Structure formats: C-alpha cells, structure tokens
Amino acid sequence: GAMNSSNYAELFNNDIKLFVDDTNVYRVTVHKTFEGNVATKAINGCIFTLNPKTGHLFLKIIHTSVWAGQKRLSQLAKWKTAEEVSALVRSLPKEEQPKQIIVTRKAMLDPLEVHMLDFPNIAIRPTELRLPFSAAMSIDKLSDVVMKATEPQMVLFNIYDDWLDRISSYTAFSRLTLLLRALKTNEESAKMILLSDPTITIKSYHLWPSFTDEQWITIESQMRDLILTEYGRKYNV
Amino acid sequence: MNTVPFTSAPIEVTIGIDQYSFNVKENQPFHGIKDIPIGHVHVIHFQHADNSSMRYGYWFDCRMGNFYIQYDPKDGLYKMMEERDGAKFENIVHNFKERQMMVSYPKIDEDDTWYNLTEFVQMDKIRKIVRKDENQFSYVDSSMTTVQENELSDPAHSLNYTVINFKSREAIRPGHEMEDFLDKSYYLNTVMLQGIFKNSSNYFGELQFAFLNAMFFGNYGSSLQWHAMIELICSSATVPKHMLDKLDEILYYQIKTLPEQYSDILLNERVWNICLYSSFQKNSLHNTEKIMENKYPELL
C-alpha cells in the first residue's frame, strides 16, 4: 500500500525501488499577449526517477518539442511520464528492474499502472511523505543540463555524490531531503549556505560540495535553521 | 398462456414471478401460477418467511418445456423440475385450475414493463452465463459469485458474466495506453461488440440479465456487472446512435422498476454521476437523466 513514516526503513532494504516525481515534466511561463490575453510558453522539463538506496538518478529530459500541437498538456504530461518510466524499466536488465515504483503524486498512479500492465509483479505505490523533489531544478548542474537540451535526452547521476562511502542510505536520503526542502523553502539562502566558504568546492563529477563530516553537521544545522526561520516568517511565529 | 404448477407449499414463503410478488402461508392450498405470457423469459423466485437468507429462483421459458415447482425437505428449498409426460402435466394443470388453486400472472394490458426489462434477454444466453446443461431452466441466488469476483470459489456455481476490467491488457492496446484508458471505444466496439458479444443485442441482454439478478436476488456481483456494462458504453466517445438511444430506454425502465427503498444498495453513486454528468455520453441519456433526477436526486 502507501509508503509513509511507519514503513520508512523499507526505502533502504535490498528490494530495488524507484521514486518517480513528475512535478517538473511540464513547465511553463505565463505571459500577456499583444491583444492582452494570457498565453503559456513551455520550457524544458524533466522526470526525476531516483533509487533511494543507491542514489542513482535517471533524469529524463522532456524537451519542449514533445508538447508541439498537443492539447490538455497537464494531462498528457502524466501519460508521457508513465510512458518514459515504462521505457526505462524495459531498458534495464531483468536483475536491475525495480520491484516497486513509488509515485510522489497520486495522479500518476493510473497512468503508470496502465503503462506497466506487462509487469504485473512491479507494485505501483503512492506515498504519504511530502518529498521535496520539485526542487531538483535548484541543483545547478541538473538545471543546466535540462535547459541546454535541444532534444529528448536521458542523463544519469548519483544524487548522493560519494556520501555512501561514509554514511548509510538512510542518512544520505535524510541529508538529500533536508537540502531539497531548504532549497524549495528559500533557494537564495540555501545556495548561500552551500557556497559560503569559497575553499569548499564541488568536484567536476559531483552535484554538491566536498564537505568533511564535521562541515556536513554544520551545513545540516544551518539548513534546519533556514527551514525554521522561514516557517516563522510565513506564519508570523 | 403457460402454467407453472406447484406440488404444494409446505413452508411459508414470498413467491416472486417477474416484477410481481405474493405471500404464501405454511401448508396453504397453493398450486402455482397460470396465464404466464408466452414470448418472454420469466423468473420465479423465493424468499423464505422463516429465513430471509438466500433469496433464490429460476429463469425459464415455457416454450422450452413443461416446468413445475416442488419443495424438497432435504435440501430445504423450492426446486424447479421438468415434466417430460405432456398428458400428465396437462391433467395436473387442468385439475388445479378447475379448483382455482393458482394465482394468475397479473399483467395489465397497457403494461409493457416486463418486455421493456427483458427485450434482449434470451434463455440460450442465460444458460451460458449460468452453466447446468442437464436443465432447460437456470437457478440463481443471492450468494452466487461471478467469475470476476472469483478471480480477485466453486467454479460450477459461478455466474459466467463477461469479464470487464478497465486496467487490463484486454482493455488497453500496447502503444495506445492514454487513448484507450480515457476513451473506451476500442474496448467497447472491437473487443466486446465485434469480438465477444458479436452484436449490441447480446451485450444488452447480458446487461439486462445482470440488472434483474441484482434487483430480484440482491446479487452483488450482478450489480457490479450491470454498472461495468453501463460505464463501458458511457466512457466510449464512439458509440452507434441506435445503441445510445436503446441504452437510454433500457436504463429508464430499470430505474423506473427499482424499489425506491433499495436505491441505497442497488445504485453506485460514482458510476451514475460519472455516466450522467462527466462521460462522453452525459448528454445522450435524456430519459434516464430525467427519471434519475426526479426519483433519486440524493444519489446525484
């Protein structure tokens, strides 16, 4: 059934599973026309497909050409997501195929179930977790590959960098959700926290800076401070 | 006008014959039902006074044989049987009619209700849904599960309705996932009408039989099937005009006949709201929409 706080350790067991987040598939800017009507302009989007145990991220870039001449784009985006996750599963060797796919939004359940009818043993689950994967496009290197794309593209990343050399999956996923929640809540303040000390860099082959174990504790504290600060600003608390 | 005689009525029972019903007392001198209209299927149904559990009954056509009811005190029910001796059967019926020991099928001349509920229902199609080839009549009761319910446990006692499943490979062509899921026309026209049922008359017969078993026995699997066959049409953008017009007639008479006080157990809120207000066919069922809004405005 639903993935919630009760069954959280299941994310880090040895059963292959993927999170799918469709928030950033269909992305628009809204603007006035010459006649004073309103129009949208699509920008490149992405599917965020993540193995929370290993950190492997399958970032399928959704190029604006896929919307050309199509209607009901917010509906189509869910079915295009399901079509691309189905295609990813079929592309993987059998021993790498997931046993579960957890969708971050319940509107993805029917589209994904219908595209995965050929895989009756892959469970398609919703989640009661509020996950901040919409903020993926606040990670500069992810935003950059999506914006530069001139055609449909799959790009593979490890969203945990080398953290699993030093910490467990559980801890790496907790760090990732804290960083993405802070970037969702106050992007400018979160990026300043991450880049504030010039001497700590991001390796060419990484997404995040090269913090020591003690620096990660400081950074995590500063991210929790930001989130709490913003909650007090929002609610006047 | 055909006759179903009864040997006797040893236990107190509510007897239905189609949409009619009569109460019979324990050891009342009751010997059956006469003046049954030829040209239709019929259903003779029972609910025991001392145990309203198991509604049960028999679908039959007097053109197919001479049928009678006899109580079995071992199995504790009224059983339909066939009498193969024509002269014996005629002489039994004649004696019971002469002694006025039979109720008359109470059909008003102006009243087409039963024809309207059974227009497409054929005994040969009933005998394929309910499989007991040694009898010419078909036993149904309140507890019999459908092949679909059983998939999700005695297969010989099942209702073999056609399985309808919107999230199945049968309903969805690989490559047309969004198309086939949002517009069920493929599944209705190619898979169901052209493939399985062969024509709209057989599809409507099964829909009508499901409704009747839901209404007369409170058969839950039958109610599920009736709603699935409605939803499959209403969820199709491409339906022949004759089928939409006939469906509106079919559903109007079914909603007209439903006991007002069983609307809570016999009508699915989701399916009816989707079919009348959201679906491709929301504007195609004018008579059904009008009776539903006037009789059951709470459901909607």
Coordinates of C-alpha atoms in Angstrom, one line a residue, chain B residues 23-293:
Chain B
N23 CA -47.1 -14.3 0.2
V24 CA -47.9 -18.0 0.7
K25 CA -48.7 -19.4 4.2
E26 CA -47.3 -22.7 5.6
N27 CA -49.4 -25.5 4.1
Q28 CA -51.6 -23.0 2.2
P29 CA -53.5 -24.8 -0.7
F30 CA -51.4 -23.1 -3.3
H31 CA -50.7 -25.0 -6.6
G32 CA -49.0 -22.5 -8.9
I33 CA -49.1 -19.6 -11.4
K34 CA -51.2 -19.6 -14.6
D35 CA -51.6 -17.2 -17.5
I36 CA -47.8 -16.6 -17.9
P37 CA -47.3 -14.5 -21.1
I38 CA -45.6 -16.5 -23.9
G39 CA -42.8 -14.7 -25.7
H40 CA -40.5 -13.7 -22.8
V41 CA -38.2 -15.3 -20.4
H42 CA -39.6 -15.4 -16.8
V43 CA -38.1 -15.7 -13.3
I44 CA -39.9 -17.4 -10.4
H45 CA -38.2 -16.5 -7.1
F46 CA -38.4 -17.3 -3.4
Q47 CA -37.6 -15.7 0.0
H48 CA -38.5 -18.0 2.9
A49 CA -40.6 -16.4 5.7
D50 CA -38.5 -18.1 8.5
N51 CA -35.1 -17.3 6.9
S52 CA -34.8 -14.2 4.5
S53 CA -31.2 -15.5 3.8
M54 CA -30.9 -17.0 0.4
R55 CA -33.2 -15.2 -2.0
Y56 CA -33.2 -17.9 -4.9
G57 CA -35.1 -18.6 -8.1
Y58 CA -35.3 -20.0 -11.6
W59 CA -35.1 -18.4 -15.0
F60 CA -37.3 -20.3 -17.6
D61 CA -39.2 -20.0 -20.9
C62 CA -42.5 -22.1 -21.1
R63 CA -41.7 -22.5 -24.8
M64 CA -38.8 -24.8 -23.9
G65 CA -40.8 -27.4 -21.7
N66 CA -43.3 -28.0 -19.0
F67 CA -41.9 -26.8 -15.6
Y68 CA -43.3 -27.3 -12.1
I69 CA -42.1 -26.4 -8.6
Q70 CA -41.8 -29.0 -5.7
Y71 CA -40.4 -28.4 -2.2
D72 CA -37.5 -30.6 -1.2
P73 CA -37.5 -31.1 2.6
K74 CA -33.9 -32.5 2.5
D75 CA -32.3 -29.5 0.7
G76 CA -34.9 -27.1 2.2
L77 CA -36.0 -25.3 -1.0
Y78 CA -38.5 -25.0 -3.7
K79 CA -37.0 -26.8 -6.8
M80 CA -38.0 -26.3 -10.4
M81 CA -38.3 -29.6 -12.3
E82 CA -39.3 -30.5 -15.9
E83 CA -42.2 -32.9 -16.6
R84 CA -41.5 -34.8 -19.9
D85 CA -45.0 -36.5 -19.9
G86 CA -47.2 -33.9 -21.6
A87 CA -50.6 -35.5 -20.9
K88 CA -49.8 -36.0 -17.2
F89 CA -48.7 -32.3 -17.0
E90 CA -51.9 -31.1 -18.8
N91 CA -54.1 -33.1 -16.5
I92 CA -52.4 -31.9 -13.3
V93 CA -52.7 -28.2 -14.5
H94 CA -56.4 -28.7 -15.6
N95 CA -57.4 -30.1 -12.1
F96 CA -55.5 -27.3 -10.2
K97 CA -57.2 -24.6 -12.5
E98 CA -60.7 -26.2 -12.0
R99 CA -60.2 -26.0 -8.2
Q100 CA -58.9 -22.3 -8.6
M101 CA -55.7 -23.2 -6.6
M102 CA -53.5 -21.0 -8.9
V103 CA -52.7 -17.2 -8.9
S104 CA -52.9 -15.5 -12.3
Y105 CA -49.9 -13.6 -13.7
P106 CA -51.3 -10.1 -13.0
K107 CA -50.4 -8.4 -16.3
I108 CA -52.2 -5.1 -17.1
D109 CA -52.9 -4.9 -20.9
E110 CA -51.3 -1.4 -21.2
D111 CA -48.2 -2.6 -19.3
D112 CA -45.0 -3.3 -21.3
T113 CA -42.7 -3.3 -18.2
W114 CA -41.6 -6.9 -18.4
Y115 CA -41.0 -6.7 -22.2
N116 CA -39.0 -3.5 -21.6
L117 CA -36.9 -5.1 -18.9
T118 CA -36.2 -8.3 -20.9
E119 CA -36.3 -7.1 -24.6
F120 CA -32.7 -8.5 -25.3
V121 CA -32.7 -11.4 -22.7
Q122 CA -32.7 -14.9 -24.3
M123 CA -32.9 -18.2 -22.4
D124 CA -30.0 -19.6 -24.6
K125 CA -27.7 -16.7 -23.3
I126 CA -28.9 -17.2 -19.7
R127 CA -27.9 -20.9 -19.9
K128 CA -24.3 -19.9 -20.9
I129 CA -24.0 -17.4 -18.0
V130 CA -25.5 -20.0 -15.6
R131 CA -24.0 -23.4 -16.6
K132 CA -26.1 -26.5 -15.7
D133 CA -26.7 -28.1 -19.1
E134 CA -29.0 -31.0 -17.9
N135 CA -31.8 -28.5 -17.1
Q136 CA -33.6 -26.2 -19.5
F137 CA -34.1 -23.6 -16.7
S138 CA -31.4 -21.7 -14.7
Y139 CA -31.0 -21.4 -10.9
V140 CA -29.7 -18.1 -9.5
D141 CA -29.4 -17.0 -5.8
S142 CA -28.3 -14.0 -3.7
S143 CA -24.9 -15.5 -2.8
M144 CA -23.6 -16.8 -6.2
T145 CA -20.3 -15.1 -7.1
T146 CA -19.2 -14.1 -10.6
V147 CA -16.1 -15.5 -12.5
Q148 CA -14.6 -11.9 -12.0
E149 CA -15.3 -11.9 -8.2
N150 CA -13.7 -15.5 -8.0
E151 CA -10.5 -14.3 -9.9
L152 CA -10.0 -11.5 -7.3
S153 CA -14.7 -20.4 -5.1
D154 CA -16.7 -23.3 -6.6
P155 CA -16.5 -22.7 -10.4
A156 CA -19.6 -24.9 -11.2
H157 CA -21.9 -22.5 -9.1
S158 CA -20.5 -19.2 -10.7
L159 CA -22.1 -16.5 -12.8
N160 CA -20.1 -16.5 -16.0
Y161 CA -20.6 -12.9 -16.9
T162 CA -18.2 -11.4 -19.5
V163 CA -15.2 -10.0 -17.5
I164 CA -14.8 -6.2 -17.9
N165 CA -11.6 -4.7 -16.4
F166 CA -10.6 -1.2 -17.5
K167 CA -7.0 -1.7 -16.3
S168 CA -6.3 -5.0 -18.2
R169 CA -4.3 -5.8 -21.3
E170 CA -7.7 -6.8 -23.0
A171 CA -8.9 -3.1 -22.5
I172 CA -5.6 -1.4 -23.5
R173 CA -3.7 -1.8 -26.8
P174 CA 0.1 -1.6 -26.2
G175 CA 1.0 1.9 -27.6
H176 CA -2.5 3.3 -27.1
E177 CA -2.4 3.5 -23.3
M178 CA -3.7 7.1 -22.8
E179 CA -6.1 6.9 -25.7
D180 CA -7.7 3.5 -24.7
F181 CA -7.8 4.4 -21.0
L182 CA -9.5 7.8 -21.5
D183 CA -11.7 6.7 -24.5
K184 CA -13.0 3.1 -24.1
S185 CA -14.3 2.9 -27.8
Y186 CA -11.7 0.3 -28.8
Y187 CA -12.6 -2.0 -25.8
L188 CA -16.4 -1.5 -26.4
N189 CA -16.5 -1.7 -30.2
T190 CA -13.6 -4.1 -31.3
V191 CA -13.1 -6.3 -28.2
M192 CA -16.6 -6.5 -26.7
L193 CA -19.1 -5.9 -29.5
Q194 CA -17.3 -7.3 -32.6
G195 CA -15.2 -9.9 -30.7
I196 CA -17.1 -11.4 -27.7
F197 CA -20.8 -10.5 -27.9
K198 CA -20.9 -10.3 -31.8
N199 CA -23.7 -7.6 -31.6
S200 CA -25.3 -5.0 -29.4
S201 CA -28.4 -7.2 -28.7
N202 CA -26.3 -9.9 -26.9
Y203 CA -24.4 -7.1 -25.0
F204 CA -27.8 -5.5 -23.9
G205 CA -29.2 -9.0 -23.0
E206 CA -26.3 -9.6 -20.6
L207 CA -26.7 -6.0 -19.1
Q208 CA -30.5 -6.6 -18.6
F209 CA -29.9 -10.1 -17.0
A210 CA -27.3 -8.6 -14.6
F211 CA -29.7 -5.9 -13.5
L212 CA -32.6 -8.4 -13.0
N213 CA -30.4 -10.7 -10.9
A214 CA -29.2 -7.7 -8.8
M215 CA -32.7 -6.5 -8.2
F216 CA -34.6 -9.8 -7.7
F217 CA -31.8 -11.6 -5.6
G218 CA -29.7 -8.7 -4.2
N219 CA -26.8 -10.5 -6.1
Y220 CA -23.9 -8.1 -5.5
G221 CA -21.7 -9.5 -8.4
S222 CA -24.6 -9.0 -10.8
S223 CA -24.9 -5.3 -9.7
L224 CA -21.1 -4.9 -10.3
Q225 CA -21.6 -6.3 -13.9
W226 CA -24.6 -4.1 -14.7
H227 CA -22.7 -0.9 -13.7
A228 CA -19.5 -2.0 -15.6
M229 CA -21.5 -2.6 -18.8
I230 CA -23.1 0.9 -18.4
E231 CA -19.8 2.6 -17.7
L232 CA -18.1 0.9 -20.7
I233 CA -20.7 2.5 -23.1
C234 CA -20.8 5.9 -21.3
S235 CA -16.9 6.0 -21.2
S236 CA -16.7 5.5 -25.1
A237 CA -16.6 8.6 -27.4
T238 CA -17.7 6.5 -30.4
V239 CA -21.0 4.6 -29.9
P240 CA -23.6 3.9 -32.7
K241 CA -26.6 6.2 -32.3
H242 CA -29.0 3.2 -32.2
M243 CA -27.1 1.8 -29.2
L244 CA -27.2 5.1 -27.2
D245 CA -30.9 5.5 -27.9
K246 CA -31.6 1.9 -26.9
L247 CA -29.4 2.2 -23.7
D248 CA -31.5 5.3 -22.7
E249 CA -34.7 3.1 -23.0
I250 CA -33.2 0.2 -21.2
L251 CA -31.9 2.2 -18.2
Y252 CA -35.1 4.3 -18.0
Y253 CA -37.3 1.1 -17.4
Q254 CA -34.7 -0.3 -15.0
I255 CA -34.6 2.9 -12.8
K256 CA -38.5 3.1 -13.1
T257 CA -38.9 -0.5 -11.8
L258 CA -36.2 -0.3 -8.9
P259 CA -37.9 -0.3 -5.5
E260 CA -37.4 3.3 -4.1
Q261 CA -36.1 1.8 -0.8
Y262 CA -33.3 -0.4 -2.5
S263 CA -31.7 2.7 -4.3
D264 CA -29.0 2.9 -1.5
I265 CA -27.9 -0.8 -2.1
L266 CA -28.6 -1.1 -5.9
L267 CA -27.1 2.2 -7.4
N268 CA -23.4 3.1 -7.5
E269 CA -23.1 6.9 -6.9
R270 CA -19.7 7.1 -8.7
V271 CA -20.8 5.3 -11.8
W272 CA -24.2 7.2 -12.2
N273 CA -22.6 10.7 -11.5
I274 CA -19.8 9.9 -14.0
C275 CA -22.2 8.5 -16.6
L276 CA -24.8 11.2 -16.4
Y277 CA -22.7 14.4 -15.8
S278 CA -18.9 13.7 -16.8
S279 CA -18.8 11.0 -19.5
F280 CA -18.7 11.3 -23.4
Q281 CA -22.4 10.3 -23.2
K282 CA -23.5 12.8 -20.4
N283 CA -26.0 14.4 -23.0
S284 CA -27.1 11.1 -24.7
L285 CA -29.3 9.6 -21.9
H286 CA -32.1 12.3 -21.6
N287 CA -34.9 9.9 -20.4
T288 CA -32.6 8.2 -17.9
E289 CA -31.2 11.6 -16.6
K290 CA -34.8 12.9 -16.1
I291 CA -36.1 9.8 -14.2
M292 CA -32.9 9.6 -12.0
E293 CA -33.1 13.4 -11.2

